[PDB]
Structure formats: C-alpha cells, structure tokens
Enzyme design. Structure first.
Site, PDB file in Angstrom:
ATOM      1  N   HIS A  36      15.164  81.229  18.188  1.00  0.00           N
ATOM      2  CA  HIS A  36      14.597  80.352  17.171  1.00  0.00           C
ATOM      3  C   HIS A  36      13.766  79.211  17.776  1.00  0.00           C
ATOM      4  CE1 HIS A  36      18.522  78.174  17.759  1.00  0.00           C
ATOM      5  NE2 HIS A  36      17.788  77.105  17.507  1.00  0.00           N
ATOM      6  N   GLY A  92      18.954  69.854  19.487  1.00  0.00           N
ATOM      7  CA  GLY A  92      18.412  69.943  20.820  1.00  0.00           C
ATOM      8  C   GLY A  92      19.327  70.607  21.829  1.00  0.00           C
ATOM      9  N   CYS A 111      20.774  73.626  21.556  1.00  0.00           N
ATOM     10  CA  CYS A 111      20.672  75.073  21.594  1.00  0.00           C
ATOM     11  C   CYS A 111      20.156  75.536  22.954  1.00  0.00           C
ATOM     12  CB  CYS A 111      19.802  75.535  20.429  1.00  0.00           C
ATOM     13  SG  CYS A 111      20.763  75.472  18.858  1.00  0.00           S
TER      14      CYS A 111
HETATM   15  C1  LIG Z   1      20.022  74.038  18.059  1.00  0.00           C
HETATM   16  O1  LIG Z   1      18.722  74.387  17.673  1.00  0.00           O
HETATM   17  C2  LIG Z   1      20.780  73.675  16.774  1.00  0.00           C
HETATM   18  C3  LIG Z   1      22.200  73.186  17.030  1.00  0.00           C
HETATM   19  C4  LIG Z   1      22.808  72.599  15.831  1.00  0.00           C
HETATM   20  C5  LIG Z   1      22.113  71.315  15.427  1.00  0.00           C
HETATM   21  C6  LIG Z   1      23.089  70.560  14.819  1.00  0.00           C
HETATM   22  N1  LIG Z   1      24.434  70.911  15.562  1.00  0.00           N
HETATM   23  C7  LIG Z   1      24.290  72.115  16.156  1.00  0.00           C
HETATM   24  O2  LIG Z   1      25.092  72.699  16.797  1.00  0.00           O
HETATM   25  N2  LIG Z   1      20.845  74.842  15.924  1.00  0.00           N
HETATM   26  C8  LIG Z   1      20.157  74.827  14.655  1.00  0.00           C
HETATM   27  O3  LIG Z   1      19.567  73.867  14.300  1.00  0.00           O
HETATM   28  C9  LIG Z   1      20.214  76.054  13.766  1.00  0.00           C
HETATM   29  C10 LIG Z   1      18.915  76.840  13.887  1.00  0.00           C
HETATM   30  C11 LIG Z   1      19.033  78.212  13.234  1.00  0.00           C
HETATM   31  C12 LIG Z   1      19.816  79.161  14.127  1.00  0.00           C
HETATM   32  C13 LIG Z   1      17.656  78.805  12.949  1.00  0.00           C
HETATM   33  N3  LIG Z   1      20.366  75.618  12.407  1.00  0.00           N
HETATM   34  C14 LIG Z   1      21.659  75.184  11.940  1.00  0.00           C
HETATM   35  O4  LIG Z   1      22.604  75.187  12.662  1.00  0.00           O
HETATM   36  O5  LIG Z   1      21.725  74.773  10.609  1.00  0.00           O
HETATM   37  C15 LIG Z   1      22.942  74.264  10.133  1.00  0.00           C
HETATM   38  C16 LIG Z   1      22.621  72.910   9.501  1.00  0.00           C
HETATM   39  C17 LIG Z   1      23.788  72.365   8.686  1.00  0.00           C
HETATM   40  C18 LIG Z   1      24.220  73.381   7.621  1.00  0.00           C
HETATM   41  C19 LIG Z   1      25.328  72.795   6.721  1.00  0.00           C
HETATM   42  C20 LIG Z   1      26.216  71.837   7.196  1.00  0.00           C
HETATM   43  C21 LIG Z   1      27.197  71.315   6.364  1.00  0.00           C
HETATM   44  C22 LIG Z   1      27.295  71.756   5.056  1.00  0.00           C
HETATM   45  C23 LIG Z   1      26.409  72.708   4.576  1.00  0.00           C
HETATM   46  C24 LIG Z   1      25.426  73.226   5.405  1.00  0.00           C
HETATM   47  C25 LIG Z   1      24.677  74.666   8.314  1.00  0.00           C
HETATM   48  C26 LIG Z   1      23.540  75.268   9.147  1.00  0.00           C
END
Ligand SMILES: *[C@@H](O)[C@H](C[C@@H]1CCNC1=O)NC(=O)[C@H](CC(C)C)NC(=O)O[C@H]1CC[C@H](c2ccccc2)CC1
Ligand SMILES: *[C@@H](O)[C@H](C[C@@H]1CCNC1=O)NC(=O)[C@H](CC(C)C)NC(=O)O[C@H]1CC[C@H](c2ccccc2)CC1
Lengths: 299, 299
Positions: free
Chosen positions: B39, B141, B143
């Site tokens: 991603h 950041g 990932c």
């Molecule tokens: C690295 O790019 C990143 C790591 C995440 C950022 C925040 N903490 C982490 O470990 N991953 C992502 O951003 C990821 C990208 C995808 C794979 C395309 N997106 C992601 O993790 O999105 C989450 C955001 C929060 C959401 C949620 C939280 C609480 C209640 C409802 C929904 C779940 C998915």
C-alpha cells in the site's frame, strides 16, 4: 502502548568478554578502554568481604583476558575507579558510537542490554527507582551489562550491573563506578529501604491510557496539589510539584485533561482500587514510563 | 523476570525508507531486494478500496524512492507478491545478516523493531495471538516495520506490519506478503473474532513465577487434562494437549511441580481470581511468554 527499549545495535558493538582467573563477566569497550565491574578480580572465596585494593595489587595486565568475538585484545594498563576497573587495550574499538557517561536521576528510565560472556542476549526497559534499585532480569554472568539511552546518534551510558539484593531487585553503578544508592560490592544482604511510587510517571501513563481510548477512570472531580499529596503520602507516592505539573503540560494539552483533574482520578483509583477493570492491559498502576517516554511513544 | 526483546542490531542494518508519491513507509533491505507493504503505492483517496493491480500498472521503477540513511538506492525492477512489493535495487545490502523467512504459528513470540521513515525508534516483544492479531505499538508511518527471532547468528523474519483493527490490535503479513489471519489491506473495519488465551504460555509463566520465588498460588490439588480443559473452555483458554505437557517438561523438572498440579493451581486462579495479590509484578495472568522464552530467560 508497550514497554519499549531503544534499538540496541550501537551498544551491541561495544560488548566484550573479560576474564580474570576463572571469573568471567562482560565489559564495555569504548575507544581504547574496557570498563567492567571490579569484582571480576574476585574468587568465590573473596566475594563475602573483598579488599579490592589488596586483591588488585596481585594482578598484572596479562591476568586480564579480554575477548571480542574470536579476537583477543592486549591489555596494556589497568586501574580501579570506584567500583569499576578500566583496562587500557592496544586497539580502539572501531564500532565506538558517539557516547557520553551520565549519572541518571531517580524516576528516569533507560534500556538494559543484558549480556552473558560478552554476547547480547536481550534488551528491555527499566526505571531507576526512588530507592536507587532497578527491577531487572539478571543471572550469574550478567555483571558488566549496561543501561543506556539514545539521543539522536548519541548513546548516554548510565548504568553498569553489579549485584542482586534479597528483595530480588538489582543494584549497580554509573560508568564512573559510583553505585546508585547506599550499596557496596560485597556478597552480603543489603537493604534498599522503602520504595516509593513515581507519581509523575503514573500520571503520564494515565494520560497515555486516555490517548489510547481507555478512559473509564476519569471522574467529575478535581483536587489541589496540597490535597493530592496528603493522599500521595499515605500511599508512599512521591509528592507532586509544580515542575511535575509543567512537565505533564504537553500531555495535558494533547488530551484536554487538566493535571489536577487527572490527580483527582488518581486519588479515586488509589482509594478505591480498580474493581477488576484494567488500564492499558494492566491491573496495576504503572510507574516506569516518564512523560518523555509517553510523548515519544504517542508521536 | 521481564518482557525481553532480542538485540536489534542485525535488523537495524536492514531498514530503509521507501517513498512512492507522497506516501512514505519502511522497507526491509536484504541482498539486492527491498521488501515493503504494497500500500505504499496508495494515495489517501485509494486506501478505502484499492485495486492494487490497477494502481501498480501506473508505477515505474523510478517512481520508487528508496533511501538508506543519506544514500539513494537505484530501483531496477519491481513486482508484487501477495500484499508485499519487492523492489530490486542495484546494490546488495552489505549489512545483510544470515536470515530466513518463516511463517510463525499462533502462540509463538517474536521481537518487533518499530521504525519510522526508515529509522528504528524502539524494540519490544510480541506474541501472535490465536486470532492472528498482535498487540503492538504502531503509529502512522510504522508500516514495513518487521518482527523477528534470532537463532544464534541467524535472523528469522516472521512479520511485516500493515494495519490496525478497530479493537486497537494490529495485523500484518509474513515476508511473502500473506496476511496472518483473515485480513486484507484496505482501510475498512475488520473483525479478528474471539481471542483466546494461550494456556501453555500462562503455565510457562506460572513456572517462571515459581522459579523467581513467587509461590503463593500453589495449592494442594491436582486435576486431569480432560477436567482442566472443561474449565479452560469456559474461560476461552486454549485446550491443553499432551504435546503442551511435554513442552512444559523441562520447567516441571526444574521446579519439581507436576504439570497437572500447576493446572490445578491455574483452575483455582481462574475460578477465584487473584484476590488483589500479584504474580511476577502483574495482577493479570500473562500469556505472551512461551516455555522456550521462560527457559531462555531463567538460564
Ligand atoms: C501503516 O501504513 C499504517 C499503520 C497503522 C496506522 C495507524 N496504526 C497502525 O498500525 N497502516 C494503515 O494505515 C492501513 C493502510 C491499509 C492497509 C491500506 N490502514 C489502517 O490501518 O486503517 C485503520 C484505521 C482505523 C480503522 C478504525 C479504527 C477504530 C474504529 C473503527 C475503524 C481501522 C483501519
Ligand atoms: C554478576 O557478577 C552478579 C549478578 C547477580 C547474580 C545473580 N543475579 C544478579 O544480578 N553479581 C554478583 O554475583 C554479586 C557480586 C558482588 C558484587 C561481589 N553478588 C551478589 O549479588 O550476591 C547476592 C546473592 C544473593 C544474596 C541474597 C539473596 C536473597 C536473600 C538473601 C541474600 C544477596 C547478594
């Protein structure tokens, strides 16, 4: 939110093995000097009440075997500084990081690189307790393992491991060989005195909890500095000061919870326990995160 | 007894920064290949439902900026393997350790080197839960941060970080890009399902407690495998098997406590709670130490 150590690579490249007689422990090799606990010159029948001055006089440079991996280092000089030996060697460590020696304050944290025979085994995060002990994981052979922080590219060494106390806690020196606390390097039972909880760190950790969505412990009350400390005292918590309050400022700003409001919630937790609930996955109040640690981890 | 990570130095020398467009994350540089989460090719307005195949077709080698410290690496090839990108670069990493890729089993542990912009920030110990999540500390950041074990001089990479779940837990892939668990790399809420406690690890940790002088929870009873599991089930503990029992053998041998006797004490703890007492400084039952971990730390 996790108990996190600094990356250990810069320090891994400084650890060596020091043997004198049949006693082997770890030393720290920086520039052309190896630092290690002076009791490496002791036999088992010396550790009960050693006269280090007298014991060392019988030792020459060639009695100190220093090993870095498969390579022997030549010891060309030796001296005792407080509870540490300094062995001058003929080779500067090519892996010496930018570094300094610091004597850390109670309540602050640092990482420990636990080593055996000069080989790193593991890394973890500790705090210097108010009574100048640490709650580590150390076996026979771990002496000379060091504790450190990293600031950008600079390693600040603050701890070298020397002994265990009857309570299971641990004691050691700064890198000038002065113990933290009232301890001496002899194999007798020694007292650390009452430990106290690091109030400012518990508050920091409650802020980290709130930052991480755990908020059940927040209440509708506030208190005063004077009145919180009346409750702190009873619980052997360190008194909170306005400097603590200002240190907590950035966390108070990020969460929107006034510091004295968080103090009110802490009093209630202390008076009422946690009634089986949890906070960041702990059923106890955690005090080995500084405000700085919390800021670093939540950004 | 402490939650201990492996020394991170061998892995620190493999972390780099990978940028595509305005999206930046970490990659793992081994021989002449950089591995990173796919991603990185996504914009913020792509992560809700990305078609990675279609997105990648618009990317060429020169759209991937790979940075190791101050040095740019030339990307000379790219391909997608499951949820990971592999960027072929013109320079083998001179710091590549002996290494392999492994897909780890639920209940096992590993260290995480959390990185940002290609720079290590900290290191900690995790377990792969039965529901294939981990309880980490990860910010935007992070990932591309990896999880690993070390066996002598060999680094076994087992995890690359990709996303967070609504419960605050974390999900990711092995180094072939196959997720652990039923997850997909898109920015939607996803369910991990019921988590279960790793019974064999709790037992290992109770043995570690006994090894460390904490014994108040031992009782006068024993049980049967069948009868313990009737209680395990009710508590969403994993059933114990004879292989678990034999795995616990060396700890049973070191302490002199039969495994089924320890199971009896665990049933009582589960049925009666801990009545405010503690075990190795925790008020909860700890399940992220394997028997192997306990043996390693207590020797
Ligand atoms: C690295 O790019 C990143 C790591 C995440 C950022 C925040 N903490 C982490 O470990 N991953 C992502 O951003 C990821 C990208 C995808 C794979 C395309 N997106 C992601 O993790 O999105 C989450 C955001 C929060 C959401 C949620 C939280 C609480 C209640 C409802 C929904 C779940 C998915
Ligand atoms: C490194 O040499 C070693 C590290 C110890 C080993 C065990 N765990 C550790 O952290 N230090 C020593 O062995 C130390 C040498 C001195 C400085 C000359 N000796 C030491 O720590 O002795 C302790 C043994 C146990 C004893 C005790 C425990 C429980 C109840 C009563 C007494 C306290 C001193």
């Amino acid at each position: 939110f996790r108990k996190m150590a600094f990356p250990s690579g810069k320090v891994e490249g400084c650890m060596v093995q020091v043997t004198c007689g049949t006693t082997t422990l770890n030393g720290l090799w920086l520039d052309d000097v190896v630092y290690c606990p002076r009791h490496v010159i002791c036999t088992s029948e010396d550790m009960l009440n050693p006269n280090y001055e007298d014991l060392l006089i019988r030792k020459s440079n060639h009695n100190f075997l220093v090993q870095a991996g498969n390579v022997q280092l030549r010891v060309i000089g030796h001296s005792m500084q407080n509870c540490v030996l300094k062995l001058k060697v003929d080779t500067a460590n090519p892996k010496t990081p930018k570094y300094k020696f610091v004597r850390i304050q109670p309540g602050q944290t640092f990482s420990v690189l636990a080593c055996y025979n000069g080989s790193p085994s593991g890394v973890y995060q500790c705090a210097m307790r108010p009574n100048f002990t640490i709650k580590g994981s150390f076996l026979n052979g771990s002496c000379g393992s060091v504790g450190f922080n990293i600031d950008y590219d600079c390693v600040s060494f603050c701890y070298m491991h020397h002994m265990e106390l009857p309570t299971g806690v641990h004691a050691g020196t700064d890198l000038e060989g002065n113990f933290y606390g009232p301890f001496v390097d002899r194999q007798t039972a020694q007292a650390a005195g009452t430990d106290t909880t690091i109030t400012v760190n518990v508050l920091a950790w409650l802020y980290a909890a709130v930052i991480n969505g755990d908020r059940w412990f927040l209440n509708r009350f506030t208190t005063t500095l004077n009145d919180f400390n009346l409750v702190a005292m009873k619980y052997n918590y360190e008194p909170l000061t306005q400097d603590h309050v200002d240190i907590l400022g950035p966390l108070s700003a990020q969460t929107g919870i006034a510091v004295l409001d968080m103090c009110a919630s802490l009093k209630e937790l202390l008076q009422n326990g946690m009634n089986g609930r949890t906070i960041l996955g702990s059923a106890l109040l955690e005090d080995e995160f500084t405000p700085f640690d919390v800021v670093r981890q939540c950004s």
